[PDB]
Design a binder for this molecule. Structure first.
Ligand SMILES: Nc1ncnc2c1ncn2[C@@H]1O[C@H](COP(=O)(O)OP(=O)(O)O)[C@@H](O)[C@H]1O
Ligand SMILES: Nc1ncnc2c1ncn2[C@@H]1O[C@H](COP(=O)(O)OP(=O)(O)O)[C@@H](O)[C@H]1O
Lengths: 532, 531, 168
């Protein structure tokens, strides 16, 4: 036993020889290992000591994935992996340039948010490979446990470290790429909030020296590239979000999706099926048809499935010998997916009096909806509202209603209709709290349409908050709205004048086909939505 | 298990050799060590016992690092770490002076409130550096469980003690500087208000016998310099509000932010990226333009990000051979940051009738908003909006009441607020305390509607209005006029008493604003509607 | 740790009328206060029917944490006094301390730990203590030093405490 105590020690050293430990760490391990060399082997304390030492020696201290970065080389990797995302690619280039200039590894924090299925997770994978850095994925999700990250005390019975240390063991670099998922849906309850723990993970100051219950030594995480994923930015905790570097990822339109399909989706499903182009064939029109009438989301999540489905169906067909090559066409697609699922998208193709079109930002992406009104018949009149309306909505809608009344009587005194009668208004759900008052102006258009007996201008989508005097105010999520209007068969859009910046920041082909008005006052919208 | 029991005991004695426990803790230490000898090293309790003893001995009992200090040296530290904060520097040196006099920690504790990114936590780091004092920070923002403060008893899976005990251990001292941040964002605990736990920590006499759920030993905590931060002053409970010495950390103007940028932010960012100071030339005019049209933060954190982006964009061009050298000009800044975000400063340049300017402070610091009113058609009645409090309604009630009587004095032949149902709107966000300050504005709003005249162009005003027309004084004048200066509003009307605050402002703030001080509302009408 | 003196405060928060209770949020504190609240109202409506202060107002009340479960009832009358003090707008006959549980019809009930409570009273240097009649035996049986220089009255009903605490 006596000499065998010695034998164990150098086995720990050889694991540590090329892994140059920090000075404070060296002292901690020396104290523990010399302790291990005297403590009897049979003792459970010995095992706990050994376990603690096992993890400490297993950490790749002073070892880096030496990024053999080339600026144009890395760029090509990104292009050969994904379409679009010009903004994000530029940001990543900047990161590469920064690391090159320093001539040493550095760690930054970058967050991706937008609708699901936009490839943010897959972009993650692409970045790791481009940089020649180890990849890892983690999901905080709805969990409320801090110990998931912080681990447990090493000397305690049945000790286990947090996921941050776990992944750092398997990955053999001080500087891996860690992916963190659903940062928006972090929970709070009995044990606490992980947001408290990961505050230590997304703070540059706390990244230099990070502590856990397991390894119990200050470690350097400032070299680690943290990437976080979210769906909506609003619900992310204030301290974490404000400190965090925030990148918006958008969805895709017809042409964009189509490009993705042909370039990436179809070859990926062929790999899964073991199929080749020599046996399974797909034209653009087919996928165009598949995009138009079989999907609704701004992402391409559903589209992968439909393509996977078709190719999957074809695989069976090939084996059986029903037809030796399968070419999918609009003629024979009905065999693969059945009849078109979403034949129509505007549930009112002509909008009847007192119905308007609004555009709304949702967690799942850009969505169109319709606001409807109804009548239910000296005394004062009323509004009744329905929908999953928050306290905000109720207040904003009253203001809408107030501006409605005054607007109409000032513009046309003979028309006492709105004020003297009872009105039902309904606003459909899915609108996020912040994007909620964005359909204020549409509401007002709704009432006035109802008032004069005038239907609205065909194919008109809108957004914008309205003040009591009738000042149009700027709104968020313009990128998503426009994409939604495209699919929704819209020809005219009406926005805040303050939002002109946001509109023109879009690519040209996306904005194309759509007449755009920027407005500042409601008298303007009134003229636009009712030409005559 | 051979030498296992003896070695563990001996190493703890080595720890106890430096960090000697109080005289009543001898028995507790010895008892644990003796029964450790009883427990087999295979038993579950043995492992837990070793943790308890390790945690206990690791605490620097009666051991503190030296403190060498000077008030004049502190000012040099304060000056070099941050520019500006004339009043803030003054306020903190007062405590340093008082602490130097006594040579020990005051009963009263220190807290700072202001906009996010103003440098409240920076002050704490600077004070620690000034005192040559060790620093630690733990957050109490959003917490609801007292057990977070007191830890858990050892039987818990992965037993973890109180956070206060932790910070003492890591600092290896009896007298650390601790930042207890976000005391305002404290939660009203269901199992019991953490107010009790907080008051224990604040009181030095109570700290002498502090107990947790883990150690079960009265910690002789004293001389620990507790420093706290807050955002607004309301959310702090009543017993904690008065128990706290409070400091106002105000926001900054354009010129102030620029000096911060030139001295601190640019070098920080240059150092972080390792950039050449010649190749990434940054003009002062750019930063002024950036401030005016790209940012709305009272703090510097949002500004700092935009600054980082500037330098970041440059770094790519240099490596790739896109550009030989980076010369940041207003003309070519579009490539580096993109299109202007706030080309619009303040809306309602022409202020329509029934609209009046409004001022207050918010979580984000200095704020601007407008009061809005309209009609909705023998009697007359008032509808109010916003997410307003019960107190806010009563302020309006006072305002509405006075407006009727005031209209009578000026124009008896009128009956506008008399025979008419009016909708009133007040934007929210502002602190409940400073909420009634829009009172007079409201009166102006109602009156403005009466004859159908717009309020004198580019006119701003605020302050609480009583029943007699008396203009009551309001806090945070610095914040309100900062917003007014942002707004580009030339004439400001303020309460008479608050004239002290205006003359206490530095030169930059007071530039080109024709302010008048007033006591009754009839005085404001003299300005608002002379015709 | 021993017998202690505890302060009771009432505050105005400004049909309807309610009492808001703070401190230890134990149920037994709440119910005792409710009792106390209602009796106070009941007492007021007969003594001064003209006043409707307590009836038409929201009042905040706070009690310190230094109480055992049995001490909850023990501070019954103190609440009532405080409420009537707030209602009449007059502080008590100066330097008067007291301990007693109050029935809903106002009769006083026995309390525990008279020995320990009296010590704190003498320590704080109160002129007078008024106690329930049923607690009579315990006080006379105490140590010598505490007895002299303390005015004592024994009470069965709160009507008595009203006249003592407020001369007119
Ligand atoms: N712009 C794009 N170009 C190419 N493929 C894309 C693009 N956007 C999404 N994809 C594909 O979409 C698929 C699903 O994306 P995924 O990463 O699961 O979504 P999310 O970003 O919501 O996590 C991926 O396999 C990816 O290749
Ligand atoms: N007046 C100032 N001069 C120089 N730096 C400042 C100033 N105000 C803030 N800072 C900067 O703010 C950064 C952090 O601010 P922080 O303390 O987090 O603000 P807050 O406490 O308001 O959230 C530091 O890097 C510091 O350099």
């Amino acid at each position: 036993e006596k000499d065998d105590k010695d034998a164990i020690e150098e086995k720990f050293r050889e694991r540590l020889k090329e892994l140059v430990v920090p000075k404070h760490v060296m002292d901690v391990v020396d104290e523990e290992l010399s302790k291990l060399g005297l403590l009897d082997n049979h003792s459970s304390e010995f095992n706990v000591t050994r376990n603690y030492l096992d993890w400490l020696t297993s950490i790749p201290w002073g070892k880096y994935s030496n990024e053999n970065l080339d600026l144009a080389r890395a760029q090509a990797v990104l292009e050969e992996d994904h379409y679009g995302m010009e903004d994000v690619k530029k940001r990543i280039l900047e990161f590469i340039a920064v690391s090159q200039l320093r001539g040493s590894t550095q760690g930054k924090i970058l967050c991706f948010y937008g609708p699901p299925g936009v490839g943010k997770t897959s972009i993650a994978r692409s970045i790791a490979r481009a940089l020649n850095r180890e990849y890892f994925r983690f999901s905080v999700g709805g969990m409320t446990d801090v110990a998931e990250i912080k681990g447990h005390r090493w000397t305690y019975v049945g000790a286990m470290p947090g996921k941050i240390i776990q992944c750092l063991k398997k990955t053999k670099t001080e500087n891996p790429l860690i992916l963190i998922d659903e940062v928006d849906m972090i929970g709070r309850g009995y044990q606490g909030d992980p947001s408290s723990a990961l505050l230590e993970l997304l703070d540059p100051e706390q990244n230099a020296n990070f502590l856990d219950h397991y390894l119990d030594v200050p470690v350097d995480l400032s070299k680690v590239l943290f990437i976080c994923t979210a769906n909506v930015t609003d619900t992310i905790p204030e301290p974490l979000r404000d400190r965090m570097e925030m990148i918006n990822v958008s969805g895709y339109v017809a042409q964009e999706k189509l490009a993705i399909a042909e370039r990436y989706l179809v070859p990926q499903a062929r790999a899964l099926c073991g199929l080749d182009e020599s046996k399974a064939k797909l034209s653009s029109d087919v996928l165009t048809l598949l995009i138009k009438q079989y999907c609704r989301e701004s992402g391409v999540r559903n589209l992968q499935k439909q393509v996977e489905k078709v190719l999957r169906k074809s695989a069976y067909k090939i084996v059986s010998g029903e037809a030796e090559s399968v070419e999918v066409t609009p003629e024979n697609l009905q065999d693969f997916v059945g009849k078109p699922v979403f034949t129509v998208e505007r549930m009112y193709d002509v909008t009847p009096p007192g119905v308007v079109m609004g555009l709304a930002w949702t967690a799942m992406g850009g969505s169109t909806l319709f606001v409807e009104t109804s009548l239910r018949r000296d005394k004062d009149g009323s509004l009744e509202v329905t929908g999953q309306l928050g306290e905000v909505m109720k207040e904003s809608a009253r203001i809408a209603y107030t501006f409605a009344r005054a607007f109409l009587m000032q513009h046309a005194p003979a028309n006492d209709y709105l004020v003297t009668s009872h009105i039902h208004l309904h606003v459909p759900e899915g609108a996020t709290p912040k994007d909620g008052p964005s359909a204020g102006c549409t509401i007002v258009t709704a009432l006035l349409s109802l008032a004069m007996g005038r239907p609205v201008r065909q194919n008109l989508a809108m957004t914008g908050e309205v003040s009591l005097t009738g000042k149009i105010l700027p709104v968020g999520g313009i990128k998503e709205k426009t994409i939604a209007a495209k699919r929704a068969g819209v020809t005219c859009i009406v926005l805040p004048a303050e939002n002109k910046k946001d509109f023109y920041d879009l690519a040209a082909f996306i904005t194309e086909g759509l007449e755009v008005h920027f407005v500042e006052h409601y008298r303007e919208i009134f003229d636009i939505a009712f030409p005559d």
